[PDB]
């Protein structure tokens, strides 16, 4: 307990599953560790519409998190410094999700604009924009 709105997404830290993160419509991402009643910390995203999704970068060379919002943005975070590493803009409608691929140096996002976008994990520039023609 602690979130002040709909908890939209929950996900274990693949590098330390004793902790996990919760993406909430209260514009917050909370990270907790199994056994505690209070979170280890609370990250404010600055995404006025809330967090629809949250995902961990699976590799050990960086402690990153990524959040998607209805405010059209995608923000990469470093959960150690609680700082925003980058902001991905380009989607025209609510961003439903965004994840780091487990192998490729890319980020995948999807939105109600009927678009799947692939971004460069390093330059954070959009790489490809496909519309499988299936709507949102």
């Amino acid at each position: 307990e602690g979130h002040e709105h709909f908890v939209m997404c929950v996900a274990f830290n693949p590098k330390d599953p004793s902790t996990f993160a919760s993406g909430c419509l209260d514009r917050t991402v909370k990270v907790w560790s199994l056994g505690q009643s209070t979170p280890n910390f609370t990250l404010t995203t600055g995404q006025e519409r809330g967090v629809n999704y949250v995902d961990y970068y699976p590799l050990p060379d960086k402690p990153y998190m990524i959040t998607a919002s209805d405010d059209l943005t995608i923000k990469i975070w470093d959960y150690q410094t609680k700082s925003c590493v980058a902001t991905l803009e380009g989607h025209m409608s609510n961003v439903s999700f965004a994840v780091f691929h487990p192998t490729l140096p890319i980020i995948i996002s999807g939105s109600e604009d009927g678009t799947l976008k692939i971004w460069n994990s390093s330059t954070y520039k959009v790489e490809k924009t496909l519309n499988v023609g299936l709507e949102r």
Binding site: R27, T42, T44, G46, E48
Partner: protein
């Protein structure tokens, strides 16, 4: 009929905050870039420039009574500088989220900060800048 005259224009990054000094022909501007500037709009000479942070600074006010300027930025911090030396007076986290507005009491050593954390906080500089109240 209003006799409008353009006394001074200047180009720069987006300015989110602005304030007039009470007795010096200065204007303070807080930019989206993290810069805060002071301009003598009558001589058209820039008084000073400060890189407060890399985050945008939405609020900024003079506090002539003390020769200061107080600014609020997206990094959730309220910082105070002495405008005569460019010296940092205080620097502290006031909210867990973006700061939008700052008001300064005309008589008492009080400062109000509005934030995206859904609150307004009252600070007292004649008490080590303590949080005296949260609305």
């Amino acid at each position: 009929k209003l006799d409008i005259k353009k006394t001074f224009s200047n180009r720069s990054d987006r300015v989110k905050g602005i304030d007039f000094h009470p007795t010096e022909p200065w204007v303070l501007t807080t930019l989206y870039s993290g810069r805060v500037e002071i301009w003598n709009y009558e001589t058209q000479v820039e008084v000073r420039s400060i890189q407060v942070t890399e985050t945008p600074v939405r609020a900024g006010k003079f506090i002539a009574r003390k020769n200061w300027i107080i600014v609020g930025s997206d990094d959730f911090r309220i910082r105070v500088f002495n405008y005569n030396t460019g010296e940092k007076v205080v620097d502290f986290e006031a909210h867990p989220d973006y700061i939008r507005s700052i008001a300064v009491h005309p008589t008492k050593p009080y400062v109000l900060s509005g934030s995206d954390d859904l609150t307004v906080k009252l600070w007292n500089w004649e008490n080590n800048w303590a949080l005296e109240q949260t609305f």
